[PDB]
Structure formats: structure tokens, C-alpha cells
Predict the 3D structure of the following.
Amino acid sequence: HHWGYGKHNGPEHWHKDFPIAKGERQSPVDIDTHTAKYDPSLKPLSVSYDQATSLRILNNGAAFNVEFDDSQDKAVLKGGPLDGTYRLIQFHFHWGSLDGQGSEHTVDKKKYAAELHLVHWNTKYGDFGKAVQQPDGLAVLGIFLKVGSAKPGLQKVVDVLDSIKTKGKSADFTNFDPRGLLPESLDYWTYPGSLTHPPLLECVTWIVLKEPISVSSEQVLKFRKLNFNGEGEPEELMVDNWRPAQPLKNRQIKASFK
Ligand SMILES: [Cl-]
Ligand SMILES: [Zn+2]
């Protein structure tokens, strides 16, 4: 049937319906910190989320997305390896069934408990739909989550998961400040890649932060109570919604620090 993360429709099967799965700039990848090249010409990231307006949270069957109003430059990302302004449209996570796995990108083969993706689109293209068809259409900020101390700023998200347990459910989710999910340092690694789930379009400039944020075991546990299935169907827990690392091929990973 259609794509998913199960045994018969998981990542290893995606290439049949989405040939680009075997493309030249697929994500995620393993970040070898010793082969990454420090690029002195990379500018610091500029994150302006002071005007962000969240609208709703939804379970799309693959993860849960927190959507923002992207009709104006309210929450934007610029600087770094980017040319132009990118507007935040949504953020979501990828997590595992155990604390030892869950992230998409890995650092020197190290896996984290989860990975947060803040998706932004290049305003020059007018809308997200047009942006995904361009090589420089999206900018995704990736943040690693490790299990330890609780992250107060994430609790508002955790408490609403009860209302969107099954595929298709959505709920109002206003006044959420994404700044509460960022680590102290903004040092990063960057490389050209793709979305990590179908349609797997190669339109992403990845910006992966070096510093992970910590969340408590209890917070991550709530993530694992969501369902892949729709209401009234056999219960399938939403866990391990991550894709394994892909070959780097003809690509170089640059670092903003040394
Ligand atoms: Cl993604
Ligand atoms: Zn993602």
C-alpha cells in the first residue's frame, strides 16, 4: 500500500514509489566530525522567531506537525549558508521506540533519542508548494534531543498530544513560542540534502546544530503513545519514524566552527 515505517512499507521500500530515494543528495547522513570542513566564510545563523504565530498541531500519520502562519515574514531564518529569507511553516520530530535510537542524522555514528526539524521555505518562491521544486527551496534546522533533564519549553506540546492521538486529528495550538526549543549555541554543520520522508525531494539546505537539547524520559514517553493508525483501526504505536543514514556520495559537510 502507501509508504510508512512498518516492515512492508518502510524506508527500504520507498524507492519503488519514489525513485528519487536512490538519488544523489538524499538525507539523512552520518556526520563525520573529523572530515567536516570548517568554512570561515559561513556567516552566523540569524533566527528571528519573536513574531511567530503558531496555528495548529496535527497528526498526519507519520509524525505530528505544529503549523505556523507563513503569510508574512513573522518567523524567519537567514544568514548561515543561506541566500535570502526563509519562512518557518512547521516543525515536527522523529523519535524511536527506545532512548538509544530515534534521530535521523547521526554524529560519528552516534544516534540520539529524537530529532527536531524546523522547516522553512525560500520566500523568493512565493509558497511552500513552489519552493519544494527548487534546489534551494527549503532550509531545515535540525536539533538533536537527548534524554536527561526536562525541557520546560516542550511541555506545552507534550500535554496536547492526548487530543491528536490518531491519524488525521488536529487541534488548535496558538501562542507557542518555538524559541523555547533552541539550544544555547547555534554552531552548526550544513550540507545539501532532501526531505527525509516521501516525496523525498532534494530541495533542502540542512543546518544541523552541534548542541543537543535535553528532554526528560517522561516527555519522550508521551511521543511514543501516539498512533500511526486512524481512529477505529488496529492500534499501531507511532515509534521509530526515522530513516536510516544515506550515502554522502558527492557531497561535503561544512562546519561553522572549528
Ligand atoms: Cl523531514
Ligand atoms: Zn523531518
Notes: The helical segments are 14-17, 128-131, 155-160, 217-223. The radius of gyration is 17 Å. The first strand starts at residue 30 and ends at 31.
